[PDB]
Design a binder for this molecule. Structure first.
Ligand code: ZN
Lengths: 122, 355, 115, 157, 244, 99, 267, 41
């Protein structure tokens, strides 16, 4: 829960910088109907960015509400049913991945055969 | 599978990562910079050249050299980047004189990372790399002198400047003061050893100012006044005086042409016929004059400016050839005399007078 | 005209520099001949200060002309960057309104972020 | 030079007069002040730098014996490393004005006898000392010492 | 050939009757070699999960040529680490490799060569990821050596190394990854923060307790993260001023 | 205080030269604004990573919950891809049968 | 033209420099000789400063004369919008460059299909610029477009795309027959010379290098921009060793982002 | 006469020279010798 809220909070900061870059590109291209279209794109980008800032302050407050262990005590120097759930889903998509590999190999072989047979007809 | 011959690959990699340091060792020894030799650094998988004493400097006091050489701790060179021809020197200083509003308010060891890449001719350890390093160290010294004077004068400062400006960035290569009441404008001082000058650069960083710095009209004379006497408190005084006049003068139309003479001696020229001098002075006072007249032979007139009749009476309202003597104001009467009011089209009072 | 005014003002500038340096040397030699014990003719000493301000007036004329010409040429460059006269006024009010729209969009949303 | 020469001739003619700056003031300050307005509104630290940057193999400390807080300084180092064997402590005599000159290794031949292995350490160390460039550091001596110990381990086995 | 004058090579190329058997055996050789290359790439994608490895076979083949594009990216950082990409040109008895940075290597038809090659490329990826990650997190890249030359000799290929520094000075992180003996990664603390550091009487000032003298080693298992670059990012964030 | 608010203030400071009423002024202002903006962005990411590290060492069941969720989304995404592919295969069998 | 703009701004700074240097001469002469410990040393300092100031005045006058030799020749709302537009454009260019150099995006994940008409429009747009490059699209095998880019009398490049994204390239020489017996493109061949096999390898690194994730127009445009620099093969010398020939090879490496010639052995 | 000159290209004037010699008893093994040449006709 909260350890995915930290992930969402990282993604918001990663999105804010990218969105400001896109805003500056829009302001780079704007040459004094497509006038109005660039206006709409600019205003919509600014709206989404304000939404991102509000969401970021929300995520900051949520994670800052929920520390007894200081950092640099956390790094290893040299000198229970959810685990079974993990093992279940791991075995499940192990089988799914092997079946996907068989499908992918047969598609590869069909593509290679088609290209070889069609290459030799000339 | 023993078809790799690991020993030869190891010897080739060892030569190609070690032999760049040998040319650097020779070029350091030709300029007689004392260094510990090429050493394995900490972990086994690196290399470094640590200097001991960078040769003093040229043209700074001995107080500054004793204050530098007791503040340096380490100046390692390391080799990095693809092609293995990008040196990075890591200077680390102790006892930094002044912090910044940027959060470098931590433990008093600042790290300065200089990076050098020689061209693809003139090999990886050459005369050019050490020459660039000595120029960068010279730059750090010739700005450390000014920063020492400023950090000495910081506890006894005229205390209106202490509200006017706080320090944003001191990297030992730049000094970025941020001034303004809202701290919205910024100067940046940096020694430039190509021209052997200082460079003052102006910028607007902060959400309350004009569309420009408003000292950019006087930037050349600011740079010259700083190069003549490199004192930061002098610079802050000049900015503190000339900010409120120049912020009004830059809102004039352009008809109005702004020739700055020497700093604090802006001179306005209406169209071509009319001229008016402006002297910023201390304590929010600006003295204006007539321009076209002489400061010497009163009868004679300046080459391109025709005298403005009746100028003295108009200035007196805000407060024969007696426009030639100056008339002081408040900066607030200068705001009223220059900011465009509708008429007692939005023109200025002053351009209505000259029109 | 501004190029030709610039060509007019250059030899006057060299003349003012020559007279300024020579008059500075004359006044300095006269003042050293009074200050040290020396005879010297009073003569047509031709004051220094007028030459100095004359040089400053010539530099003001030069910088005035060049700032005018630079503003004019930058003006023409951005004017070419951007045939009935009402069509001209229509696209001009269009451009002014569009730039106003960009500016107010930026200001309103940079204020909509905080405060 | 050109267009500036008569000023240069006047001023170079009139140097060494004690009333010179009076003459310059009287001839130049009223013009400038009319136009421009009125004027303006124990142990040397190089060794501490070396010792602070040494590898934790070495354990350099000052000699209890010998003169202290004076020109030259004297060091007794150590060596700790699981790979390397325990060896005699090594004695160094660092001159004052330490950079621009080479420190000296106080030789103790008698403790480098009484074993073949310490003899090999000593021979290899004197060899790398002869191989060293001039005006080397302290760390060059300490690293030739550690490399000498390593070669005398390898040559023996 | 007469008026438009031809050399020896064009003349012999016009008149060269190659039999059916040579053509069919070259086609079968290319089929088998291409199947072996696909098998080694998929075996590395199944076995090794630490960086990752991708492949994109081309649409168009000949009877004697195919092509892939092999990426090696870490799991959750596909925008940062895009610095190792390959293109293999599977001929009849040769696999010709063109790197992203202009290195051309011709392998042979054995499947041990391609395996050792891609293992060395995964080892170099584990360092270029940390370099381009320290680009993002503001850390300063002190030293970088693509094929390091000190230490133990690695069997497959050379080993790579960086060392980066914390943006506020104090901490440093050194990575040394090798294809057979991977990831000896170790931080560097400041002095006055080890406290098992045997002090010396030569240092009589407190200014030298700010240099980073000591070096401890991070045990890489038991570090939290499901990846390498994830673990590096958590390690880099742990050695930052605790902002809270 | 409250790095969010410094991020907001610096982001508004990036635009301050445009919204009011040549080249080197613009250049130095842009460089300083963008550098402070990216610096506070990196500090915010560092804060979120430190908090995630403390959660992953203190309360590790949450991490396992997120892994469960991601593997389940991988399963559903794989099945969606194979279903689209299977419909395309059946359409192509109906096409190739008609020659 | 812009050269008049630059010459006028140059000569503006020349006048300001001349005026300030003249005033600096007279200001340093106003103060008089300083003290400077040694008498010989104070004489030397005063003479040196005066000489340097005079030399700077002469240099500034000479530069003004050189610019003179080289010089050539409601409404306010519109000009205010023009100035603010150029300001916003330059500001956005700088900020966009600084921000896309340092992106913090790590993965595309959170928490190819194109009409061939669009490909033809894009590649014809690229073919309109670069008047020495002619690009001739054809589709012998399905939607995958194949391009012959001829380049001067120097190169013939066969580019094999896949959904408007470059896939394979083969560089052959001018005379070389790029056609098969039936007049189709020879997609699978080599070029009988050492030089053009090296340029095929460099072109494959070029298509591996210029990779934006999403937008492919910048990719093809940048690849053609890089490819255009090969017109100075056999004429450009290497920027590391000066010579033309290392092991009988011209400098085959046009470096990305700064199109300079190198022998690939000189990296 | 069985040697291999490996020129370093990032820094020329540096050669690693591999000399291959026959080990006397083992007829199917080689012995390598690595030299480090430097070079300025
Ligand atoms: Zn070359």
């Amino acid at each position: 829960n909260t350890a995915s809220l930290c992930r969402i909070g990282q993604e918001t900061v990663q999105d804010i910088v990218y969105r400001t870059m896109e805003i500056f590109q829009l302001l780079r291209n704007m040459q004094l109907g497509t006038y109005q279209d660039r206006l709409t794109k600019l205003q919509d980008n600014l709206r989404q960015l304000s939404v991102l800032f509000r969401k970021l302050r929300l995520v900051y407050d949520k994670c800052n509400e929920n520390d007894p262990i200081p950092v640099e005590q956390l790094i290893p120097y040299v000198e229970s049913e959810e685990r079974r759930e993990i093992a279940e889903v791991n075995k499940k998509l192990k089988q799914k991945n092997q079946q996907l590999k068989q499908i992918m190999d047969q598609l590869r072989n069909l593509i290679w055969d088609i290209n070889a047979m069609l290459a030799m007809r000339n | 599978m023993c078809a790799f011959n690991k020993v030869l690959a190891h010897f080739v990699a060892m030569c190609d990562t070690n032999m760049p340091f040998v040319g650097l060792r020779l070029e350091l020894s030709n300029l007689e910079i004392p260094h510990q030799g090429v050493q394995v650094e900490g972990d086994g998988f690196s290399h470094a050249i640590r200097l001991l004493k960078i040769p003093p400097c040229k043209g700074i006091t001995e107080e500054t050299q004793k204050a530098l050489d007791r503040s340096l701790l380490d100046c390692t060179f390391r080799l990095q980047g693809r092609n293995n021809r990008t040196w990075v020197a890591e200077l680390v200083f102790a006892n930094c004189p002044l912090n910044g509003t940027s959060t470098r308010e931590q433990g008093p060891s600042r790290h300065v990372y200089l990076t050098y890449e020689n061209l693809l001719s003139e090999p990886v350890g050459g005369r050019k790399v050490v020459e660039m390093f000595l120029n960068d160290w010279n730059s750090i010294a010739r700005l450390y002198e000014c920063v020492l004077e400023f950090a000495r004068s910081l506890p006894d400062i005229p205390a209106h400047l202490n509200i006017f400006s706080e320090v944003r960035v001191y990297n030992y290569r730049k000094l970025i003061l941020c001034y303004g009441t809202t701290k919205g404008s910024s100067i940046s001082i940096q020694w430039n050893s190509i021209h052997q000058k200082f460079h003052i650069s102006l910028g607007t960083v902060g959400p309350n100012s004009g569309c420009s710095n408003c000292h950019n009209t006087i930037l050349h004379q600011l740079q010259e006044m700083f190069n003549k006497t490199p004192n930061v408190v002098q610079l802050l005084q000049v900015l503190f005086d000339t900010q409120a006049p120049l912020n009004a003068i830059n809102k004039l139309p352009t008809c109005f042409s702004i020739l700055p003479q020497s700093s604090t001696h802006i001179r306005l020229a209406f169209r071509n016929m009319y001229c008016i001098d402006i002297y910023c002075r201390s304590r929010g006072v600006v003295a204006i004059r007539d321009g076209a007249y002489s400061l010497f032979d009163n009868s004679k007139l300046v080459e391109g400016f025709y005298p403005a009749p009746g100028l003295k009476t108009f200035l007196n309202m805000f407060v024969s050839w007696a426009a030639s003597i100056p008339t002081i104001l408040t900066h607030s009467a200068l705001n009223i005399l220059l900011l465009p009011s509708p008429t007692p089209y939005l023109c200025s009072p002053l351009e209505r007078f000259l029109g | 005209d501004p190029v030709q005014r610039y060509k007019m003002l250059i030899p006057q500038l060299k003349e003012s520099l020559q007279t300024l340096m020579k008059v500075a040397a004359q006044n300095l030699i006269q003042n050293t001949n009074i200050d040290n014990g020396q005879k010297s003719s009073d003569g047509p000493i031709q004051r220094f200060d007028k030459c100095l301000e004359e040089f400053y007036a010539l530099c003001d004329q030069l910088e005035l002309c060049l700032r005018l010409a630079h503003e004019c040429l930058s003006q023409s460059c951005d004017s070419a960057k951007h045939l009935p006269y009402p069509q001209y006024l229509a696209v001009i009010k269009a451009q002014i309104s569009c730039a106003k729209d960009i500016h107010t969009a930026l200001l309103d949303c940079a204020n909509k972020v905080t405060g | 030079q050109y267009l500036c020469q008569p000023l240069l001739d006047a001023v170079l003619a009139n140097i060494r007069s004690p009333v010179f700056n009076h003459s310059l003031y009287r001839t130049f300050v009223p013009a400038m002040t009319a136009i421009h307005g009125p004027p303006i509104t124990s142990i040397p630290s190089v060794l501490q730098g070396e010792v602070a940057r040494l590898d934790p193999k070495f354990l350099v400390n000052l000699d209890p014996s010998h003169c202290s807080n004076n020109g030259t300084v004297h060091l007794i180092c150590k060596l700790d490393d699981k790979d390397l064997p325990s060896v005699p402590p090594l004695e160094l005599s660092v001159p004052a004005d330490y950079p621009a000159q080479s420190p000296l290794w106080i030789d103790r031949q008698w403790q480098y006898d009484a074993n073949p292995f310490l003899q090999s350490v000593h021979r290899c160390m004197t060899s790398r000392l002869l191989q060293l460039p001039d005006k080397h550091s302290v760390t060059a001596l300490l690293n030739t010492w550690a490399q000498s110990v390593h070669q005398a381990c390898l040559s023996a086995a | 050939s007469g008026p438009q004058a031809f050399d020896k090579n064009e003349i012999n190329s016009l008149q060269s009757s190659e039999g059916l058997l040579e053509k069919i055996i070259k086609q079968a050789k290319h089929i088998f070699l291409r199947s072996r290359a696909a098998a080694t790439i998929d075996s590395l994608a199944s076995r090794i999960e630490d960086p990752q490895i991708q492949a994109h076979w081309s649409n168009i083949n000949d009877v004697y040529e195919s092509s892939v594009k092999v990426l090696i990216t870490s799991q959750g950082y596909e925008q940062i680490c895009k610095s190792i990409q390959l293109q293999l040109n599977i001929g009849v008895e040769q696999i010709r490799v063109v790197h992203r940075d202009g290195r051309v290597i011709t392998l042979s038809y054995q499947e041990q060569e391609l395996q050792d090659f891609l293992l060395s490329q995964m080892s170099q990826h584990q360092v270029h990821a940390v370099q381009q990650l320290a680009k993002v997190m503001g850390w300063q890249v002190l030293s970088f050596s693509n094929h390091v030359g000190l230490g133990p000799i690695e069997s497959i290929g050379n080993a790579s190394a960086i060392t980066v520094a914390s943006p506020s000075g104090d901490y440093a992180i050194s990575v040394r990854n090798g294809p057979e003996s991977g990831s000896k990664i170790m931080v560097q603390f400041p002095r006055n923060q080890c406290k098992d550091l045997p002090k010396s009487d030569v240092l009589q000032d407190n200014k030298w307790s700010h240099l980073r003298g000591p070096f401890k080693e991070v045990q890489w298992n038991k570090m939290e993260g499901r990846n390498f670059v994830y673990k590096m990012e958590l390690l880099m964030s742990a050695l930052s001023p605790c902002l809270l | 205080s409250t790095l969010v608010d410094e991020l907001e203030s610096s982001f508004e400071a990036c635009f301050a030269s445009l919204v009011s009423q040549d080249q080197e002024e613009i250049r130095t202002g842009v460089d300083q604004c963008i550098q402070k903006f990216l610096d506070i962005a990196r500090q915010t990411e560092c804060f979120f990573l430190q908090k995630r590290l403390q959660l992953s060492v203190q309360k590790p069941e949450q991490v396992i919950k997120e892994d469960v969720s991601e593997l389940r989304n991988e399963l559903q995404r794989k099945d969606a891809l194979v279903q689209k592919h299977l419909t395309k295969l059946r359409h192509w069998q109906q096409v190739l049968e008609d020659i | 033209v812009s050269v008049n703009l630059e010459a006028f701004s140059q000569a503006i700074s020349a006048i300001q420099a001349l005026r300030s240097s003249v005033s600096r001469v007279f200001d340093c002469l106003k103060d008089g000789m300083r003290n400077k410990e040694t008498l010989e040393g104070r004489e030397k300092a005063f003479i040196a400063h005066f000489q340097d100031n005079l030399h700077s005045v002469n240099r500034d006058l000479n530069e003004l004369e050189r610019l003179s030799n080289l010089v050539g020749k409601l409404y306010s709302q519109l000009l205010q919008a023009y100035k603010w537009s150029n300001k916003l454009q330059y500001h956005a260019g700088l900020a966009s460059g600084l921000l896309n150099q340092q992106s913090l995006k790590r993965s595309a994940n959170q928490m190819l299909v194109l009409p061939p008409q669009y490909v033809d429009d894009v590649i014809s747009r690229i073919d309109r610029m670069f008047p020495e490059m002619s690009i001739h699209l054809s589709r012998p095998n399905g939607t995958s477009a194949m391009l012959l880019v001829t380049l001067g009398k120097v190169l013939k490049v066969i580019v094999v795309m896949r959904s408007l994204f470059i896939d394979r390239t083969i560089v052959k020489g001018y005379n070389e027959n790029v056609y098969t017996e039936d007049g189709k493109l020879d997609i699978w061949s080599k070029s009988n010379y050492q030089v053009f096999q090296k340029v095929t390898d460099h072109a494959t690194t070029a298509l591996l290098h210029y990779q934006l994730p999403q937008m492919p127009d910048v990719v093809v445009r940048s690849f053609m921009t890089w490819l255009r620099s090969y017109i100075k093969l056999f004429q450009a010398p290497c920027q590391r060793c000066g010579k033309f020939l290392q092991d009988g090879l011209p400098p085959t490496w046009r470096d990305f982002r700064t199109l300079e010639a190198f022998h690939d052995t000189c990296r | 006469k069985n040697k291999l000159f490996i020129k370093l290209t990032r820094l020329p004037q540096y050669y690693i020279v591999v000399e291959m010699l026959e080990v006397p008893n083992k007829p199917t093994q080689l012995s390598y010798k690595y030299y480090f040449m430097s070079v300025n006709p």
